[PDB]
Scaffold this active site. Sequence first.
Site, PDB file in Angstrom:
ATOM      1  N   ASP B 368       0.845  -1.187   0.000  1.00 40.55           N
ATOM      2  CA  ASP B 368       0.000   0.000   0.000  1.00 40.55           C
ATOM      3  C   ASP B 368       0.881   1.239   0.000  1.00 40.55           C
ATOM      4  OD1 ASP B 368       0.891  -0.348   2.593  1.00 40.55           O
ATOM      5  OD2 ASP B 368      -0.888   0.582   3.462  1.00 40.55           O
ATOM      6  N   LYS B 369       0.286   2.402  -0.233  1.00 41.78           N
ATOM      7  CA  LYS B 369       1.116   3.533  -0.620  1.00 41.78           C
ATOM      8  C   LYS B 369       1.549   4.368   0.580  1.00 41.78           C
ATOM      9  CE  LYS B 369      -0.519   7.236  -2.296  1.00 41.78           C
ATOM     10  NZ  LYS B 369      -0.880   8.583  -1.810  1.00 41.78           N
ATOM     11  N   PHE B 531     -13.949   7.716  12.648  1.00 45.19           N
ATOM     12  CA  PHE B 531     -13.287   7.538  11.364  1.00 45.19           C
ATOM     13  C   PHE B 531     -13.058   6.055  11.110  1.00 45.19           C
ATOM     14  CE2 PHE B 531      -9.496   7.192   8.643  1.00 45.19           C
ATOM     15  CZ  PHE B 531      -9.967   7.868   7.536  1.00 45.19           C
ATOM     16  N   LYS B 560     -14.914  16.064   6.846  1.00 39.27           N
ATOM     17  CA  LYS B 560     -13.598  16.038   6.221  1.00 39.27           C
ATOM     18  C   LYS B 560     -13.360  14.655   5.630  1.00 39.27           C
ATOM     19  CE  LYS B 560      -9.942  16.256   8.889  1.00 39.27           C
ATOM     20  NZ  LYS B 560      -8.971  16.924   9.796  1.00 39.27           N
ATOM     21  N   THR B 599      -4.621  14.624  -0.929  1.00 41.26           N
ATOM     22  CA  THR B 599      -5.740  15.548  -0.936  1.00 41.26           C
ATOM     23  C   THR B 599      -6.788  15.176   0.105  1.00 41.26           C
ATOM     24  OG1 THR B 599      -6.846  14.302  -2.692  1.00 41.26           O
ATOM     25  CG2 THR B 599      -5.395  16.106  -3.352  1.00 41.26           C
ATOM     26  N   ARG B 793      -7.475   1.514  -3.852  1.00 41.99           N
ATOM     27  CA  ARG B 793      -7.890   0.248  -3.250  1.00 41.99           C
ATOM     28  C   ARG B 793      -8.283   0.486  -1.796  1.00 41.99           C
ATOM     29  NH1 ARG B 793      -4.620  -1.842  -7.436  1.00 41.99           N
ATOM     30  NH2 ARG B 793      -5.924  -3.445  -8.435  1.00 41.99           N
ATOM     31  N   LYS B 799      -8.255  -4.451  -1.031  1.00 39.00           N
ATOM     32  CA  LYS B 799      -6.872  -4.900  -0.953  1.00 39.00           C
ATOM     33  C   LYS B 799      -6.781  -6.385  -0.644  1.00 39.00           C
ATOM     34  CE  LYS B 799      -5.489  -1.109   1.636  1.00 39.00           C
ATOM     35  NZ  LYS B 799      -6.012  -1.918   2.744  1.00 39.00           N
TER      36      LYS B 799
END
Lengths: 362, 1126
Positions: B368-369, B531, B560, B599, B793, B799
Amino acid sequence: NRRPKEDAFTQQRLAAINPVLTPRTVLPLYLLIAVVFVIVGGCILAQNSKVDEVTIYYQDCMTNATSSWSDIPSEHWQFVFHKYKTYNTAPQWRFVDDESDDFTKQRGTCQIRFTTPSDMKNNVYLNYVLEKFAANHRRYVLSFSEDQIRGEDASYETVHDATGINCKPLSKNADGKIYYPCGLIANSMFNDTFPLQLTNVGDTSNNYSLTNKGINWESDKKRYKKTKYNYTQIAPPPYWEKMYPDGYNETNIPDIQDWEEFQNWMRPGAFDKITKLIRINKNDTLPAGEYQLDIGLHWPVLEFNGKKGIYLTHGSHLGGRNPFLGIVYLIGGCICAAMALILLTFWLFGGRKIADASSLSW
Amino acid sequence: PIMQYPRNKIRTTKYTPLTFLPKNILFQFHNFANVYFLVLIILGAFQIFGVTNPGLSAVPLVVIVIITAIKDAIEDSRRTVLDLEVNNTKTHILEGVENKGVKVGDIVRIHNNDEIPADIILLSTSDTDGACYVETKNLDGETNLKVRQSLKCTNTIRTSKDIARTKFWIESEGPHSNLYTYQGNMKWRNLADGEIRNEPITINNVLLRGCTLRNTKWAMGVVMFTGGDTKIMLNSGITPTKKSRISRELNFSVVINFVLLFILCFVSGIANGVYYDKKGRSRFSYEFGTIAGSAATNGFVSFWVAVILYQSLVPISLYISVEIIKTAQAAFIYGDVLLYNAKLDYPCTPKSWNISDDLGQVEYIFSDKTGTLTQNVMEFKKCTINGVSYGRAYTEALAGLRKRQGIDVETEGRREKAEIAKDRDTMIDELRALSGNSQFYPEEVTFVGEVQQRCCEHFMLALALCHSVLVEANPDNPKKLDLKAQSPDEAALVATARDVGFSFVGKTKKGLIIEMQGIQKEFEILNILEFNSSRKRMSCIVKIPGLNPGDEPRALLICKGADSIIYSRLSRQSGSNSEAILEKTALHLEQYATEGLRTLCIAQRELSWSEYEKWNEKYDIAAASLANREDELEVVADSIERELILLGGTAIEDRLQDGVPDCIELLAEAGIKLWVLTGDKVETAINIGFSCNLLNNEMELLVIKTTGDDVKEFGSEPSEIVDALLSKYLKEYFNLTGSEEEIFEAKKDHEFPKGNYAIVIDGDALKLALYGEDIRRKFLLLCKNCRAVLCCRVSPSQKAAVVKLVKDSLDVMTLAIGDGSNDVAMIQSADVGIGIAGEEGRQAVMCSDYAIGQFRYLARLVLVHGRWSYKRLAEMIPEFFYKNMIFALALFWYGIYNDFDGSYLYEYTYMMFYNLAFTSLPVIFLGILDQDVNDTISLVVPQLYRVGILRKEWNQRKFLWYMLDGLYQSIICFFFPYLVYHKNMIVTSNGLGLDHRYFVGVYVTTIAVISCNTYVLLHQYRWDWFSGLFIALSCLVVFAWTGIWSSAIASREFFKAAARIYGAPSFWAVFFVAVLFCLLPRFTYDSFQKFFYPTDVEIVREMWQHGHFDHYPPGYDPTDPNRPKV
Ligand SMILES: *[C@@H]1O[C@H](CO)[C@@H](O[C@@H]2O[C@H](CO)[C@@H](O[C@@H]3O[C@H](CO)[C@@H](O)[C@H](O)[C@@H]3O)[C@H](O)[C@H]2NC(C)=O)[C@H](O)[C@H]1NC(C)=O
Ligand SMILES: Nc1ncnc2c1ncn2[C@@H]1O[C@H](COP(=O)(O)OP(=O)(O)CP(=O)(O)O)[C@@H](O)[C@H]1O
Ligand SMILES: [Mg+2]
């Protein structure tokens, strides 16, 4: 802190030599292994072709031999004398029936008369060869008593029900006495009374002696020791009861420590050919001449169609005349040279060269 | 005794140190090769099978069982310290003079910021009537402060001086294993008064074991009752183990070894049945016949003689060989100082010591990033508000470097030039830092009508209001206190509002302490939602006062989230300017994705309490209900966000985890097809794939990119648009790879594909691509011929289904490195399981298979440690079936010469010590300490890894050629001793007789031991001194044993086999040449291979004798940022 020990063993960096099998290194190695083994293949057959041996099988004396001297047929005798001067002459053999043994399956005295043209050197070994005798089977080779071999006056429980090696079919006889050399091995002992000499005939009439001392290894007297039985609890094995017809006296118990024919027979042969030393003469060179060998026939071999023989030899350091080690070291040297000849003529006159790094992913 | 209370530790380890031994033994005999020794030892005790030393027949079993036990005890040792450290590392004082540790009925005092290893029942605290706050971190994705309002009745106790006057624990029923329920009720009797009371105890009064307490003090309560009443012992903790492909394809190699082992016993049975109906034989006169049976039952017994005779062909020390080697290959993974994170003090930790060779044959890496590939510390702000963008950065504006010049620092000075004009005009009403590396974005904000100047100031307050940041008392310089956030992207928005003037000082019980533009207001936040990783949303419903006095004060709603969720939650028609800003603000984020900036977006609706007080109570009734840990909260939290007015979005940065020089420069030009699984958006993942070099220049970026995103509920039966479009270009991208969907030819073709062709599927387009059949197989064939699959993903099921789509539908090795709780499905579902250790110990590391400090170490873990441990074990296992083949068949070839009666050739101490001492250690040290090339060259040439991808080393073809080579060398190591005996049986120099079968067994053994260990030596790369010493010591122990065993009288028939056989030149004559003919056809086949069809690693090693790798330093690490140049 929590940092691993950098000690070049946990770091997987030890002192390696790290060989890479390039043709500039392996082609010398094939050349080295080949040129060593053709020398060892030369030096073995230089020693092995010079070995003289006399192989006379005498299982047919009681049938195929008359009381007068007849020749041994071509099947039974094998002579090897590398001085090819008297190799085609047959030995001769008579048979004295003696009429009194009353065993009639193997009795008498086969008198074998052979002639050697070359003098065998100072260690002369007289072996008996047994073909087709099956000394290598499972129940056979485990049938003795190590505590009886070590001269301990072992009871019936320690010879019959012992773990592993024990004398199961031959622990004790009918009237309750154990067998002192109990077991199928010691019962199956090669009887044939070989003489303590080779009587030279005709030309000299001075007999070539043969001792029965030094027949087994000298260090084998540490496990074969004199027995401690009180002569009243032991009996001879059921096939020894003609050489001990009245059982054991108080004086005729065989000391197996110095009875080395027993000590060779209690070492069962690995294959279907048994060759055991029985008569040695370390002292004297055996000259060229006609010798007579008087074998009291007692060990029967015809019921299993097996051969029973004599091997007279001065074997080399490799022992015996066996061309296998010379043929193999030549084949080992001729393959390592041919595989070098293949991996050099395919390497130059065609093939590939180590000239690039563009052979993996191009 | 009556109320059934035994004592227990906290968490079990399923190897109890009192009951370890009997359960380990029965575990050892699920191995069929292990229970095959229980057959031949109980058949060893019966005398009819002709085995001498039956009590010593147990020795190569008991030694293997104890070594597999002390390996299981050592593998319990580093396992039980996890349970031992949580059990009793700490104990409170519990002073009762006025009349982490387990005791039923205790009244325990619990401070802040610690784990509670019990089920405490809250009574009171420092807050109003027991208002407890808790961070339930390792149970679920609970990132809120979950309120635990305790009893408003029993708030009279403060100290342990009045509560310790009563000693009582309560009775409860059996476990239920569910979080949100507690069906217990405590009853108590008052002193000097007849008032009975049942205190209502619900989920609002209690909290579980594995949570973290925050902000409350002297948490008093009662420890649970014994048994299994804690509701975490069954929800999580029981994990299925895994083994390698090689450890799974070994069980077919064991069956081929047992099929051969029962062919040889069957030939021993029927060819001894043929012997006992021979007519004229020596077993009639001398040997008294009928060993067991008459004719064929004598041959049936001789079957089971061969079972005991071929007791070295059964692999008993195979599984302790594969498990010592896999353990030592992982203890070197652990003990590597280059796989060590110095800044975090964290060595690479194998959680699985048995899958090291899986790291040598992986083809798909599913990283994952943001947590893994990037630092996840976010610095820059880049605000966008009301259709205009406020921020200037050049950190990752170099992402589009395809059209720009070489060095560009003139814009970097314009940042600082606008930054020193920014700290002055913002320091007119603020007492925070506002200094160099304190404020984050250089942009003149209006030089403080004109609604924009409020709207940026309204943004920064509402950004600071929608936060999960608790302040922290900074110990050095406490006049400037710092910030802490569990979401580090969420801290950067808050750290920057502190810089523009909208900071916040603290946090009260119901509301919040905030310092906006100098003045210190108190915004009151009555309600907030959590969240989740799937929802992509963090929202606050903070209450504001009315501006004119004498009204009803309305409230706000600041959500948000991402730039694709709340744009699907946005009001289309309006009489305001909520529409015309969208083509501005989504144009900015496209510009602020293509420069690699992470973002967010923030929208705001002006709600009234006439519509809110129902949705508040609809959430408040659903706040203590049954679905507090279910998916019914999101549909409650969706109805009031149907229409929104967008404020703007933010575009913070996230710099990489310096995994640029591996991600292709080692680890995908290795041959591995990498797969980012971001959860961020499409344009920002392409322009971060170029930055981490994963997708490069000259690479076709075929993007799936579904165009419309909407849910269906009725209609659309005769036609289809939203699913038919992504199906059809999976066909149309099959002109790049000119094939179709129907067949899996690719399952039997593992190959690094020619043609670059990255895939940029995202989000909803993935859900439609893995929903049904005929689109999964069509997507996955496009995903075999790719090199990079990319983005969005989110909601870790995407994932986890993708790593399971490739793992199952292609028999292939998957890796899926990651970090954080959003990867505990991705890591566990993959074959290998790498995790990344961050600043704190997270859920991905504990659910991992390896754990490295950064993504930077995956290159050395895969290309060095894995690629070794593949080729080490893929060589070791064909060598292990070789070593039993050469020895245990050379007493099958003796079966020809004893008529298969099963008389032993090898004395039985050479069958004992063969698999233990004579040749066990060279095959172990080939498995532990073999390196085909160095650790540097493993990274300089990473294309060496493709032999594991191709599965070109371990296959059952190689295994059959190592049995057949072992069967050849069995013929050599028997018939070469046989043919020196076969002619006249005199092999001694002094004619005295070595005709005994044990003495021929020494001929056969010593050839078969030295030609075994030299076969191991000739098949290891890098003859090191340590394995070279124990190849020599294993060859010279078979001489040392007969020197000291055949010099005792206890060796009965084998009395002096040292002095007789080694004094015999015919031993040494055939020893030096039947080691030749054993090794010569393999050393010919290997030398013919290494000259004319060499593998890649002989080409690399031929470059290594030359100076092609002498430039590189020892311990070269090309992904380390501070390294010299080549
Ligand atoms: C060594 O020599 C002896 C004689 O010199 C060989 O003959 C064996 O002699 C014993 C007793 O004289 C035989 O046992 C007898 O067997 C008959 C049945 O044939 C039985 O009716 C008698 O009650 C008695 O038990 C024995 O069978 C005989 N050996 C053989 C093989 O027939 C002896 O064979 C020579 N070899 C060995 C290994 O001792
Ligand atoms: N604390 C927070 N508040 C609001 N929005 C957040 C947030 N944390 C993340 N987001 C947004 O939610 C989206 C999905 O969040 P998620 O939990 O997937 O984080 P992520 O995808 O960035 C971690 P990974 O890269 O390992 O998948 C992200 O695009 C992010 O912009
Ligand atoms: Mg992450």
